[PDB]
Symmetry: C2
């Protein structure tokens, strides 16, 4: 169960993999493999704190700008295998996944689909996600249904995600880049200097303490 | 004209007036009078830097929760009189102004309307504004017109405002609170500790330097 004082839903923008790869001489796929290991660390630290909703933004639509995207999706799917095997997290995908290459996308979907009984946590993984597209989907949704603010919310492409209490973005970038514009409207915003593949327990602690101290 | 390296459009969330009033023993109206003097300072500093679009969020819809709102609107209208007399800024109102008391709202509208020839600056003043209502208005707008992301943007209640390059929020609050969700998606986000009535040229300089250094 939850600890009063902690955020109920933490959103993390997994920024810095490209810079980390260049600084270490590695491939992009190798940075996303390490980044997936940091997602596994993150959800472990969240479970210790009773934080049961976690959304991570792994891939933007803008950063789909083919072979690389496939390898990155596959390193992410493989690196989530331990989370899946734990049974502690229901993994769900968000974003316009039909924009991704079909075979790597199916393998990522296959990992997530095997966690439908995972409990008590929910881990939302955003790939090919864009906030303006999310908002635009609420319009297409209302149209096909045949207007209050709560009706826009219900038709967001991310309507299954509740409000975000704390956003963490790594790499020192002080921007949201359209991450869940509706649900983060009132989120505490924390900026971590470290690149995502190097995200540490100290970084996690500093972020949580900043939320609790607000 | 503009200086390369500077933000083209600065949005400032004018936070801290209530806390400032309590800490100084003053009325809320007195804090908003001082806050309006800081808006006059802000636009002067922006003109020196060639920054020609400035949006300030003075009043949220949530913080409409009558006599007080009237006095606050009137202190704001009076405190903008010098900006109006300068001729350097076209003042425009945004937000659901029909939610405000009618006589103070008309006096604020009257100040803004007298600046239609102001040039080269544009100063947008948000009162009774809410970001989720802004987004919801884009739906009502498309409906009455009879869908691309650019069509949602065109029908925002704030469709006359372009993208924000730098957001400044005072009072140490590390939140956007739904300020222009569409236009701030890719804005640099700067958090200033000072309460808005105490906002200083050092605070302005630190914010601009943070943008230039990104």
């Amino acid at each position: 169960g939850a600890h009063p004082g902690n955020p109920r839903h933490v959103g993390v923008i997994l920024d810095g993999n490209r810079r980390w790869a260049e600084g270490h001489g590695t491939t992009l796929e190798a940075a996303y493999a390490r980044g997936a290991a940091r997602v596994a660390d993150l959800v472990s630290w969240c479970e210790t704190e009773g934080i049961a909703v976690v959304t991570v933004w792994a891939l933007s639509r803008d950063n789909l700008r083919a072979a690389a995207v496939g390898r990155i999706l596959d390193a992410t799917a493989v690196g989530l295998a331990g989370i899946a095997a734990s049974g502690r997290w229901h993994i769900r995908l968000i974003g316009e996944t039909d924009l991704l290459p079909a075979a790597p996308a199916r393998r990522l979907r296959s990992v997530a689909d095997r966690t439908a009984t995972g409990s008590p946590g929910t881990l939302n993984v955003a790939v090919a996600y864009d906030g303006r597209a999310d908002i635009a989907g609420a319009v297409r949704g209302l149209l096909r249904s045949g207007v209050r603010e709560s009706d826009v919310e219900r038709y967001l492409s991310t309507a299954g995600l509740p409000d975000v209490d704390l956003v963490i973005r790594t790499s020192g970038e002080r921007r949201l880049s359209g991450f869940l514009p509706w649900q983060t409207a009132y989120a505490e915003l924390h900026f971590t200097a470290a690149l995502w593949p190097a995200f540490s327990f100290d970084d996690f602690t500093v972020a949580l303490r900043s939320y609790r101290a607000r």
